[PDB]
Design a protein around this ligand. Sequence first.
Ligand SMILES: COc1ccc(Cl)cc1OC(=O)N1CCC[C@H](C(N)=O)C1
Ligand SMILES: [Zn+2]
Length: 139
Amino acid sequence: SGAIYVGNYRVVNRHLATHNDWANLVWEDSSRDLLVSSTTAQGCDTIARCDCQTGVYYCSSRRKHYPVSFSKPSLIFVEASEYYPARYQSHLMLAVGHSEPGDCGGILRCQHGVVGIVSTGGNGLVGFADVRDLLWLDE
Ligand SMILES: COc1ccc(Cl)cc1OC(=O)N1CCC[C@H](C(N)=O)C1
Ligand SMILES: [Zn+2]
């Protein structure tokens, strides 16, 4: 679990969005595993606007943060789960690091701000849905 709170927006994994997220829907994209809903309270998380390929993510299945080197956002094939059929997920960044399904939502940050959230993983890999291209999150 986990979310990003920026301005009047909440960014979560689409497959973990709640009934309230869908009732306050701003934008969603199944191919990215992202959903953004509106909030009444102001968030003040900062979104990175950069080309970093290193950062630190939070891993809830270890209660720890780990440093990572990750690939640039790209189209990656993700095997079927209970949430989606087998498909290409876009804007996904992969790195070597521990993850389990419930780690989805953990934040990846660089020195400039939030980069993205855990969205995929397995066998010593962890994948992050990028949010740095969503320029409207700041207005
Ligand atoms: C962090 O996720 C995992 C980590 C390890 C393992 Cl063995 C499996 C993990 O589950 C996943 O990769 N998915 C399940 C939920 C939906 C995901 C998606 N974005 O399509 C894919
Ligand atoms: Zn950065």
